[PDB]
Design an enzyme around this catalytic site. Structure first.
Site, PDB file in Angstrom:
ATOM      1  N   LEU A 116      -0.756  -1.127  -0.989  1.00  0.00           N
ATOM      2  CA  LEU A 116       0.597  -0.976  -0.479  1.00  0.00           C
ATOM      3  C   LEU A 116       0.599  -0.976   1.043  1.00  0.00           C
ATOM      4  CD1 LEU A 116       1.963   1.671  -2.961  1.00  0.00           C
ATOM      5  CD2 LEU A 116       2.407  -0.756  -2.832  1.00  0.00           C
ATOM      6  N   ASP A 117       1.754  -1.311   1.605  1.00  0.00           N
ATOM      7  CA  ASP A 117       1.907  -1.436   3.047  1.00  0.00           C
ATOM      8  C   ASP A 117       2.154  -0.071   3.684  1.00  0.00           C
ATOM      9  OD1 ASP A 117       1.529  -4.146   2.988  1.00  0.00           O
ATOM     10  OD2 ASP A 117       3.665  -4.572   2.700  1.00  0.00           O
ATOM     11  N   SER A 118       2.481  -0.088   4.980  1.00  0.00           N
ATOM     12  CA  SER A 118       3.035   1.094   5.627  1.00  0.00           C
ATOM     13  C   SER A 118       4.383   1.447   5.032  1.00  0.00           C
ATOM     14  CB  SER A 118       3.199   0.851   7.127  1.00  0.00           C
ATOM     15  OG  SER A 118       1.962   0.565   7.764  1.00  0.00           O
TER      16      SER A 118
END
Ligand SMILES: CCCCCCCCCCCCCCCCCC(=O)OC[C@H](COP(=O)(O)OCCN)OC(=O)CCCCCCCCCCCCCCCCC
Ligand SMILES: CCCCCCCCCCCCCCCCCC(=O)OC[C@H](COP(=O)(O)OCCN)OC(=O)CCCCCCCCCCCCCCCCC
Ligand SMILES: CCCCCCCCCCCC(=O)OC[C@H](COP(=O)(O)OCC[N+](C)(C)C)OC(=O)CCCCCCCCCCC
Ligand SMILES: CCCCCCCCCCCC(=O)OC[C@H](COP(=O)(O)OCC[N+](C)(C)C)OC(=O)CCCCCCCCCCC
Lengths: 243, 85, 44, 124, 246, 52, 82, 83, 106, 163
Positions: B41-43
């Site tokens: 997952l991203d930020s």
């Protein structure tokens, strides 16, 4: 207690006994200075109650505001105002020393500091003191059936006869006496029980025995203010100079 | 009434993340799986995950601990500390 | 286009479809039209 | 110091610390104070004129600016009583006469004497 | 007096229906934006609150027709000419009365769900103490306006002893001088706008969810009590406390 | 609560609640129909009392 | 409309101040019929249709009056210019 | 909920969840006192109730209007409507 | 004001939380919401390629003010949480022994 | 059977006894005590409304003198007019339904001895607001319903916004 219940009503008695029956012609020139001074004690001193950090000082200014209602019933030169100021003097002398038992009587014996800011959440550990907070406050405001309203009502009516504009302005005292008293009552009564405050005793047998006497003696006057008309019906007449 | 347990929180968050589409795999999910590294997952995707976590549990959270819940076991141990459901 | 795609399935399934959201919207209507027809025909 | 009354109390204080007055309500609730009820840490300096910035103080809304809010309230008060006053010029007339009463206007029934017939009585 | 009577049987049923749909959620929430579809789950409080709403919007059979529309009628029939303005002033309020009752019937019963799904698993009804008063107040809010319409309304009814000045009495005027249009128009447009709100909610739904910068300042005005709570608080209460500190 | 992601099961109401709904709704639409029928010229606005 | 009552009869039957006119004659059996029942809406419909119809006949002469009273408004408005 | 409560504080209206073990016994005393109070007050206030209309005759009211007219006539008091 | 770091991440995650929340309370009809949330997502995904500090700060305070325009009158609070209606109904009283003040009684 | 002192004194019983005997009776007994006395108040006032449809004359009662001075008397006069009985069958019916409705809605509320005391109290000073036959008793009930409107919606004294 003996100051606010007895020393204050003495000059309510002395304006009747000394002034009104030999100063009869010097007053009717000069009652509308008494209405100035009584109104702007009701308007001013019942408005400085709002900003008070101390807890006994609030009931002090409450005494000022009711004694300022009372002397515009005496100085009315009318027949309802005299009896209304007498029933104010006999009922404020009941409801007010009960409040001084609440502020510096009970609560200063328990916690020894009279700042308001420490005191909230009195209900969760003292229920049967928060009842005496509320019924005795709502007796001070001038809810009917308490003997303070009979006096406030008749004195505002007698001061409405003599000059109706000053009575119409002075009628706002029911509001102004509700504001600070209920603001104090709902700060003390409600909220979470305070951080600063260990839980102390319930209100004890003597500090109930005093209170119920000072509450029944308001309620009897509030249900029947006529229980002392048998005394006063001459002195309702002994002080009128309306020829 | 209705009282939650630990395994209820567990199955709700696992079936929560299996519904989400930017996960890596529906098979690598554990109690100890990192949302940022293991799940890919991203930020900013993890914030939308946190948003769904708080919508679906009822409870709302501030931003003081919205980054604290980096792994799934930390989210579960967070939510089981709150008596709201 | 939908990160939470299979999430909002049960917002629109057969419990909450367009026909079942308006299913019992008027529960006694089908009985009351019959009874009012019988009262209309029996008043004469 | 933000409000005009907080500024007017600068020359009274001599040893008072003179802190910034901030509402107790507009603090966030999620920080864990000593007093969650009033949003206040145990030994925190109270402000010059505290009880306007207490939790028990007034509600103090934060959406509109108060000046704008004054404009919008008086704007609704104006748009009601202006429109309802202009719409009294566009009114239609009535189709009926006011109804009438017997006995020289029921002057005798609502009180009245023969000399006093003007004050009491309607529509003969 | 008649509206005061039938209005109690509206409202008490509305309040204790709202309390029943608040009490029937695990969270016990109150925003209408977070209820969703509760029609199949809670049919009893549905049928009670729709007794309530159709009474409240003055639908033809119920007590609301007898108790609310005739006050709208008496504005046209009064002898003062300026009271034709309060016809439309009181009429607008009836159209606006439909547009929120459809908001509360749609956004908590008909719409797509909005909560988490546990509150849809545990959605149920309450025992007998919450069912039976809603039953009795439903019966009253249906029948009592037709039963008691001949004591308060009636025609020559000497029941209350109020003494109208006969130069001001306009009830005989407002029963007969009403044309078909001014009596037809509230009933009709109340119904028609009550269908329009449900249809515009269900089919299109972008009309109500615009993100206009201008319409939403207006929405934020009418959300915050027509700003007046801010007005009374800042300009009177707070100034009163400040000038009591002076 | 077996299927978080799945469709929701049909609700289980008891018998008394749903027969109470049917009774209340039946009396509502029935009473509406009676009062529309009995007062249709009066409630609609027919037979105006103006002179010809 | 039925005949107007006497001076005493309105005082005897205790008719309200606004209900005393030339149509008030049908009222004094109507309210009594209402008192015989319990003011119930299904009962006593004949006399209330009577009082209603008497009053419709009282309304039409009002409308004819207000129709007449508009004509000379127009007539004086035309005559004052010329 | 059923959170814990301190049992030492004594209220008058009961406390948090007042359900004492002899409430069936004390219910009998409470209903006895309530029915005794209701019946005694309902019989005590019987002669203080009167019926509004018809308590005095018409002839009394007509002659009191006459005496009003006599007293009003002697002082030379116009009607309030007379100007 | 600064490129890829924790101080910029904490800010933009806070602003993304606020941008989804300030549309959660704003509309009904979840279909429209999850649409609008996908395009809000696309607004954050589209502009997140800034390589200078200055235009980053310019878009940053511009979207702080854009988020500051669309504020709502009452945010949706769960009731047991401090904007809500269940907040502090019966807080359980703390267990405390009686602290005594009088030698004599009580 | 007076059918006024049973309209007045019976919710007075419903207020006074939940407080005096609150801890002694308990919440399970006060649920069914407070309700049924308002129920029988309610079915006395439908019966008095039915009788009052028969003839239009009310009953008043006269009690002890509150105060008289010159040109002024104030008594405790309670008179059930048509205007009074309309509001009376409104408030007794609505109240007696709410006393039953708040048995199941409050079944997990702790303090529901005080709460049923307070509901039946608000019923009582409405009961004497409506039926008093001077503007004084209309002031009495007018203030004590304001006192209850303090004491009722601030039921959770712990909550800040209620206070
Ligand atoms: C006029 C009629 C006569 C005057 C009133 C006579 C009342 C006499 C008896 C009063 C008894 C009231 C009482 O005991 O209330 C106690 C209540 C306790 O609350 P509780 O649920 O037990 O939980 C507290 C958490 N520790 O304590 C509280 O929480 C505070 C609420 C007090 C409620 C008192 C109700 C009477 C108020 C009437 C106002 C009259 C003003 C004059
Ligand atoms: C022309 C027609 C006239 C008709 C009326 C016109 C409109 C008048 C509107 C103003 C009158 C309203 C009554 C005044 C009392 C206001 C009391 C009040 O509002 O207190 C509320 C306040 C807390 O309430 P709040 O925080 O908002 O609750 C939020 C809950 N979520 O509680 C508080 O803490 C407030 C404490 C201070 C109370 C106000 C003090 C100032 C009162 C002003 C009275 C003015 C008297 C001046 C006398 C001069 C006479 C010459
Ligand atoms: C004057 C109204 C102007 C603004 C109305 C508005 O837009 O208010 C909203 C409601 C719609 O429902 P909502 O869920 O509150 O929309 C919230 C979404 N917002 C914030 C974008 C608005 O509109 C109405 O129901 C009124 C329309 C029918 C009025 C008929 C008379
Ligand atoms: C609690 C809810 C209300 C209960 C009502 C119960 C009614 C019982 C029957 C009363 C009969 C009655 O009062 O008689 C009235 C008697 C005498 O007056 P009378 O001239 O003979 O008759 C009046 C009828 N007139 C006018 C037609 C002639 O005066 C009294 O008693 C006054 C005694 C007051 C004592 C001081 C007050 C004490 C209160 C303290 C409370 C803490």
């Amino acid at each position: 207690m003996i100051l606010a219940g007895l020393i204050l009503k003495l000059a309510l008695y002395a304006i009747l006994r000394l002034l009104l029956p030999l100063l009869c012609e010097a007053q009717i020139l000069y009652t509308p200075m008494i209405y100035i001074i009584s109104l702007l004690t009701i308007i001013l001193t019942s408005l400085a109650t709002l900003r008070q950090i101390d807890l006994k000082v609030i009931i002090a200014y409450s005494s000022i505001s009711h004694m300022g209602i009372a002397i515009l019933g005496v100085c009315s030169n009318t027949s309802l105002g005299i009896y209304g100021s007498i029933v104010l003097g006999v009922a404020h002398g009941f409801v007010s020393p009960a409040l001084f038992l609440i502020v510096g009587g009970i609560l200063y014996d328990r916690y020894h500091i009279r700042i308001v800011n420490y005191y909230k959440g009195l209900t969760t550990y003292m229920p049967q003191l928060a009842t005496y907070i509320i019924i005795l406050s709502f007796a001070n405001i001038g809810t009917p059936l308490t003997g303070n309203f009979t006096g406030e009502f008749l004195s505002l009516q007698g001061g409405f006869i003599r000059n109706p504009i000053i009575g119409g302005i002075s009628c706002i005292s029911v509001l102004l006496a509700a504001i600070y008293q209920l603001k104090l009552t709902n700060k003390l009564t409600g909220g979470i029980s305070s951080i600063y405050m260990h839980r102390t005793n319930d209100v004890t047998i003597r500090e109930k025995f005093i209170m119920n006497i000072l509450i029944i003696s308001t309620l009897i006057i509030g249900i029947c203010p006529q229980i002392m008309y048998n005394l006063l019906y001459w002195t309702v007449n002994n002080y009128i100079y309306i020829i | 009434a209705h009282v939650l347990t630990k395994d209820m929180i567990q199955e709700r968050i696992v079936a929560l993340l299996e519904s989400f589409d930017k996960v890596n795999d529906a098979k690598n999910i554990t109690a100890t799986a990192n949302l940022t590294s293991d799940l890919g997952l991203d930020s900013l995707d993890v914030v939308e995950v946190v948003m769904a976590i708080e919508e679906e549990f009822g409870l709302e959270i501030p931003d003081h601990d919205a980054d604290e819940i980096k792994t799934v076991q930390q989210a579960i141990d967070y939510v089981s500390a709150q008596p709201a459901a | 286009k939908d990160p939470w795609a299979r999430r909002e399935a049960w917002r629109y399934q057969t419990n909450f479809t367009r026909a079942n959201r308006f299913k019992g919207a008027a529960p006694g209507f089908g009985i009351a039209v019959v009874a009012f027809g019988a009262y209309l025909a029996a008043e004469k | 110091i933000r409000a005009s009354f907080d500024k007017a109390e600068e020359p009274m204080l001599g040893d008072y610390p003179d802190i910034d007055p901030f509402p107790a309500q507009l603090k966030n609730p999620y920080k864990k104070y000593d007093d969650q009820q009033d949003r206040r840490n145990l030994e925190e300096p109270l402000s010059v004129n505290d009880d306007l910035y207490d939790m028990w103080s007034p509600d103090r809304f934060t959406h509109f600016k108060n000046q704008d809010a004054l404009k919008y309230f008086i704007g609704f008060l104006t748009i009601f009583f202006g429109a309802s006053y202009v719409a009294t010029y566009f009114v239609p007339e009535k189709a009926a006469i006011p109804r009438e009463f017997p006995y020289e206007g029921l002057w005798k029934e609502s009180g009245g004497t023969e000399k006093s017939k003007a004050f009491f009585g309607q529509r003969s | 007096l008649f509206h005061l009577l039938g209005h109690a049987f509206f409202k008490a049923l509305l309040f204790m229906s709202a309390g029943s749909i608040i009490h029937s959620i695990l969270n016990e929430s109150q925003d209408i934006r977070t209820y969703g579809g509760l029609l199949s789950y809670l049919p009893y409080t549905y049928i009670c609150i729709t007794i309530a709403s159709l009474s409240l919007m003055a639908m033809p059979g119920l007590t609301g027709y007898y108790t609310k529309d005739i006050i709208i009628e008496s504005t046209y029939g009064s002898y003062s000419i300026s009271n034709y303005v309060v016809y439309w002033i009181a009429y607008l309020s009836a159209v606006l009365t439909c547009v929120y009752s459809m908001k509360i019937l749609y956004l908590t019963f008909y719409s797509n769900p909005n909560n988490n799904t546990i509150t849809y698993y545990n959605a149920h009804e309450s025992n007998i103490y919450i069912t039976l008063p809603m039953f009795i107040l439903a019966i009253f809010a249906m029948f009592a306006g037709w039963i008691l319409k001949d004591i308060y309304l009636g025609v020559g009814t000497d029941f209350v002893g109020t003494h109208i000045l006969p130069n001001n009495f306009s009830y005989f005027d407002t029963e007969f001088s009403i044309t078909q249009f001014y009596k037809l128009l509230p009933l009709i447009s109340a119904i028609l706008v009550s269908i329009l709100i449900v249809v515009l909610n269900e089919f299109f739904a972008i009309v109500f969810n615009l993100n206009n910068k201008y319409i939403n300042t207006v929405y934020s005005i009418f959300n915050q009590k027509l700003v007046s709570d801010q007005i009374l608080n800042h300009f009177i209460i707070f100034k009163g406390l400040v000038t009591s500190g002076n | 609560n077996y299927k978080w992601n799945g469709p929701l099961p049909r609700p289980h109401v008891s018998a008394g609640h749903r027969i109470a709904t049917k009774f209340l709704g039946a009396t509502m639409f029935f009473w509406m129909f009676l009062r529309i029928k009995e007062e249709y010229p009066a409630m609609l606005g027919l037979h105006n009392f103006y002179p010809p | 409309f039925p005949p107007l009552l006497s001076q005493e009869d309105m005082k005897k039957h205790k008719i309200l101040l606004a209900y005393r006119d030339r149509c008030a004659a049908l009222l004094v059996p109507l309210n009594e019929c209402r008192k015989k029942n319990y003011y119930m809406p299904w009962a006593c419909g004949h006399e209330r249709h009577e009082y209603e119809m008497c009053e419709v006949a009282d309304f039409q002469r009002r409308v004819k009056a207000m129709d007449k009273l508009k004509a000379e408004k127009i007539e004086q408005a035309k005559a004052a210019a010329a | 909920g059923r959170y814990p409560f301190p049992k030492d504080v004594i209220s008058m209206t009961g406390g948090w969840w007042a359900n004492p073990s002899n409430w069936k016994l004390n219910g009998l005393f409470a209903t006895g006192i309530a029915v005794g109070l209701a019946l005694w007050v309902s019989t005590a206030t019987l002669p203080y109730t009167r019926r509004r209309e018809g308590i005095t005759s018409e002839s009394d009211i007509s002659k009191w209007n006459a005496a009003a007219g006599v007293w009003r006539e002697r002082h030379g008091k116009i009607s309030t409507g007379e100007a | 004001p600064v490129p890829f770091s924790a101080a910029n991440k904490k800010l933009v995650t806070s602003m993304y939380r606020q941008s989804l929340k300030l549309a959660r309370n704003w509309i009904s009809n979840r279909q429209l919401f999850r649409q609008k949330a996908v395009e809000i997502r696309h607004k954050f995904d589209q502009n997140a390629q800034i390589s200078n500090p200055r235009l980053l700060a310019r878009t940053l305070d511009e979207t702080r003010a854009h988020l500051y325009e669309f504020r709502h009158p009452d945010p949706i609070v769960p009731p047991s949480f401090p904007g809500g209606t269940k907040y502090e109904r019966n807080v359980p009283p703390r267990m405390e022994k009686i602290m005594q003040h009088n030698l004599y009684e009580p | 059977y007076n059918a006024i002192s049973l309209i007045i004194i019976l919710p007075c019983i419903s207020w006074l006894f939940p407080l005096f005997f609150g801890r002694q009776l308990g919440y399970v007994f006060v649920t069914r005590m407070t309700s049924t006395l308002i129920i029988i108040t309610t079915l006395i006032t439908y019966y008095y409304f039915y009788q009052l449809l028969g003839n239009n004359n009310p009953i008043n009662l006269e009690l002890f003198n509150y105060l008289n001075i010159d040109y002024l008397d104030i008594n405790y006069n309670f008179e059930i007019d048509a205007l009074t009985i309309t509001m009376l069958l409104a408030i007794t019916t609505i109240s007696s339904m709410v006393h039953i409705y708040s048995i199941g809605y409050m079944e997990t509320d702790p303090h529901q001895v005080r709460f049923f005391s307070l509901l039946s109290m608000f019923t009582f000073w409405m009961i004497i607001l409506v039926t008093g036959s001077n503007y004084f008793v209309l002031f009495v009930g007018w203030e004590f319903i304001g006192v209850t409107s303090y004491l009722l919606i601030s039921f959770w004294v712990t909550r800040l916004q209620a206070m």
